[PDB]
Amino acid sequence: PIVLENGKLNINIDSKTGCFSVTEKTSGHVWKSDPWENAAGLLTLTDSKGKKQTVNISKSKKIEVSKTAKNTVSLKFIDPVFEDGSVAKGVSIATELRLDPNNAQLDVEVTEHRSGNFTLYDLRYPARAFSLKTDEDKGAAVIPQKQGVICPSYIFPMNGGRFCKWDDATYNNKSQGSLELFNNGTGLTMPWWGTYNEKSAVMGIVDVSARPHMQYNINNNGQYLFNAKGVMSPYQRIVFLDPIWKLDQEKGKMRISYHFIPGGDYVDMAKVYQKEAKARGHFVSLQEKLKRNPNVNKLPGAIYFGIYGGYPHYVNMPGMAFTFDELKNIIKTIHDDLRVDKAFVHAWGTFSNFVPHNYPISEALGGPEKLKAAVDLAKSYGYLYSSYHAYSPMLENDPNFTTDLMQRDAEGKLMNTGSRWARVDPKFQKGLAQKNIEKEISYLGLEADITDITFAAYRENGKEGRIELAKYIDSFNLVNGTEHGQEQWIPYFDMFEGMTYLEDRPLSVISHPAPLFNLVYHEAIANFGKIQDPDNEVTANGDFRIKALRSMLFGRGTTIFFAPYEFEGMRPMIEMARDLVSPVHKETFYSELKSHEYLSADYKVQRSRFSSGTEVIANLGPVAQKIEGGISIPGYGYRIQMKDGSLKTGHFQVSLHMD
């Protein structure tokens, strides 16, 4: 067995299979290779008949493992063997394992692949590596799915209903699949993932040029590999996360950089990636943004209000649209009656054309002067204001609809026929914004802007047009936000609307929310709840009690998103956000989220520490629970140490008012 070793790590590479283990020498923990099949990698390719098959590349006809430098092992997998005994002659995979001379870091790279007369697709490499043994290792997989989750590697006490769904998912297909990088759906928002137990942690950072997918397996024994054969899996329940290199489309460097952290967990992983985020240029702190624009300080302690008038979906929809006088009175009530000191007012429905023509200010809703009177009132309060804007949609029900600004593929067919909100080719979107945004800014004296959709993901197609639009919006130096966001867009915005959680998502029944994105980026980008899942709606992600406490733990601001007719029903939640969340949000806004901890066995009691000197403890479950020192945290309760030495304690209560 070929060995790479420095002071912190030892890489044990098998000469016959190419599998490797990693001994983390400070703790002594050994990361084993594939526990199921001893597979260095899993390669999906066509056979002689043309059918797709997945093969174990350690079963290849020739395997060359040679120590090639002081700290480099080169591997070559030549002529894989199919299930029927036939050979994929002329197919080869070349890889490299490169140990850092000093640090506990191992680069893994697929350097070459040859197809011969076959077609290569997915390669899991390394396969089923860095796994945790279910109910023996007491740790978790760490997955930055949107704001982020952890997936414990062992069964633990929890509500009986949750428990049944949790355990069942680890035995069926809910616990296996793949996610993609940098989308606003089910996918990841940072190019890393990891696993840890009580002794040691490992996380892998994907090369900036590459777009692998991430395979997950959360305590599943691999029964999904045997269902079609109708036999029982012979494998052990394990947790692993694998890169999936898309060999049929990947043009970048197929490299992942593994970092090994004695005693680390998801916090330590996030702080490792934070260094790489700064080196990649994503990290532009809110302090620098405030130096450039003093109005950024209107955001700490601000509640984000979305007044949804049925727009952009419909123009002046009866029963949904607000007039500008109605908008002005909502603003006045929020300040004068509800005593809200700071706010971002976002008015969905101020123009009489459909997006992407964000003009004119609608005559039917009252006209420009009445809109200016509403914005002027908000500004007199120190509130931020923006209309709803989007430059990406092309809507069927728009009388101005045309396919002119839509993109066509190489066969001349329209793209995004299935995504009505993202149909305008990004190379046109700056031009569309230029039609009226400067006129609205100067007429209303705008201090703020929110632009929706265009920056919710970071895909390659159209990226140049999106950067052009981001640079243009940024040149105005407004306090500005965008829907969802991604790390690549952080330099151009002050806040992201979202970057929290989908309601229905893979892993939802077998994961806990963890503030992974904010552990990296809280100093750099402010985030608020998503308008589809606001703090006033009861969803899979919780009611107001749960969402307000999670807001303070994770460091995001409150989102109240409502149709006008709902407004009277919003008042109690606005008041509670005002009294509880707003002061914590304000104090912690610019700070680093230094640490996050789960303090109860059911993961419902949690503790977050911010570099402003603020400590948030909250209990997101119904029963009181004790933490160290015998302190009790009430159900749906909190214990918050503020910078000024005050201790905020309390809890939410649901009461029945029988007349």
Place this chain on the structure above:
Amino acid sequence: PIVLENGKLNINIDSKTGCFSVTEKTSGHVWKSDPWENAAGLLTLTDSKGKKQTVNISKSKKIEVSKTAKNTVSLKFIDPVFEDGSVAKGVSIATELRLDPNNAQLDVEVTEHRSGNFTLYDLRYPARAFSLKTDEDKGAAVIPQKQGVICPSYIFPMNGGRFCKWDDATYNNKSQGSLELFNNGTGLTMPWWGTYNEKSAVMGIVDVSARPHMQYNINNNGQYLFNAKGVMSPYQRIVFLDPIWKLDQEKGKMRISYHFIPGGDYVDMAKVYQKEAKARGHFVSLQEKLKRNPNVNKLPGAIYFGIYGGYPHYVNMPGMAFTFDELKNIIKTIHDDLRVDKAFVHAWGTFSNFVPHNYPISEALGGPEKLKAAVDLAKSYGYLYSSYHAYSPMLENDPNFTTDLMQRDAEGKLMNTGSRWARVDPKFQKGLAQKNIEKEISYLGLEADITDITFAAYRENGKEGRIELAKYIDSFNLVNGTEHGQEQWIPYFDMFEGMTYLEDRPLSVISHPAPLFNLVYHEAIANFGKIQDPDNEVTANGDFRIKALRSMLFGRGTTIFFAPYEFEGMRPMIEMARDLVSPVHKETFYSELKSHEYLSADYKVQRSRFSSGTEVIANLGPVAQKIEGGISIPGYGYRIQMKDGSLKTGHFQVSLHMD
């Protein structure tokens, strides 16, 4: 054009295509044939290269349509044509339209199909019939998905976040797909569906011998049919529900019976099927069951308590399992401190072997005498009691695991390798129950029983074994319940745990819960909330405020499902359920749910009337709303007229206590 007609309906059949329209003569409403492509049916079959294609059968080379009787038209679709111009020579579909001589009822049957050298799969017939025009018809599709939903045929005011998800889903693939009959997942619980506008309603009742699937299209314009071609759909947004006949599988009579109801809605549809439900033998009333077993009267006004000790998933799991003394103390507190007058106590974890060996009573938890003391205490309060039982599982972590009791398919492969809870062949399950259930009944003096899993669905395979087990359990004449249930099992049980809603489900963002199953069966089967989604958990289906109010509207009982460590957190919800839901559940338990109404434009205010004389009005949204006569229903509030004429009004409040 060929005409079938009686005093109520006129059927116009096109001789060129086989499409037909139905005029309801009293209202002038015309139900149209396929508005998109004028297809009588859509047939999926292999071509001469063996690739599956879907064809419009009205494009067949030879279409024959003629009156073969006074009220029968026979149709023959001969030699379908593919899109490339080639003919599926020797394929034929024969159908019949049979008008009832007196009633507004049309039977539609696929009587014959020939495949030649081709293979036939799905047949949508009739294709895209009985549709509603989106934003013109103001009605809904009616779908008995579990407890049931309606899908409105127009856009209407609602919370802005809900609105965005709603409208967006009608444009993408979330609004098209198919469901199956009689499962405990995403599917239907009654063999009917329908559509209605403000003028008239139509529903189709599937023949008892057939198992079609149901295709849905909820306000979608068919863009899903054109995305692969990269063109914009030229069709209009419509609502339709189609039977999918599985020609490759179906052995029953492929008949659907359409009933046309002037001025009807989902309530009238349910009452039409209720007559058929009785004719089919499903309907055995709770009054009959009470006559046979007076202990049935321990259910009205009872809270269903599931004490979840980590079983059947684990045996004596630390941190989850309760001792029998702890169980006894929970029963005492519920009665003495929480003053719960009636209850069903369901203890998950009383045996020291894994299911399906439901024995012996665990010595580690205290042994038989201490369990008997807990059960004796419950009986002294008049409470019902059952342990957790299941005879269907075969679990990987059971030391007694064997594939000997599992079922194999025609190829000899194990079935249900991916469904650990339903692996034992039903033909073995009565014998597994016989091993100890009579000894538990005799030793504990049991009055009740709940058996899980086996009766949650109604599939053809294994049904003889399940019927055998159901008869055996029913022969004990205990007050008995089972997980989820289906209509076919109603004669054998007194209560169903479930028959509510999945949390994640197709159509969830474009439908409203409606009590369709209980509008049929409330007199015949009691139902309670599902243990995965109990009234103490905050989920996609609501918090305690929403679930308690929906409980009273739909006529279901309270479910409190908890791990023992949560108990102290359950107290406020047990109290509010006791004060509000339990007296209404008690009064309405045996009655017919005569009617259900949506009273507000956002469908959140609702009114239910029970044949006990009880009226429930509730507001499941945050804002107060006015109904007829200017009466105001507070957000999360109610207005209940009891049988004795007294009025109850009130509302839930969420408060923030700050020390």
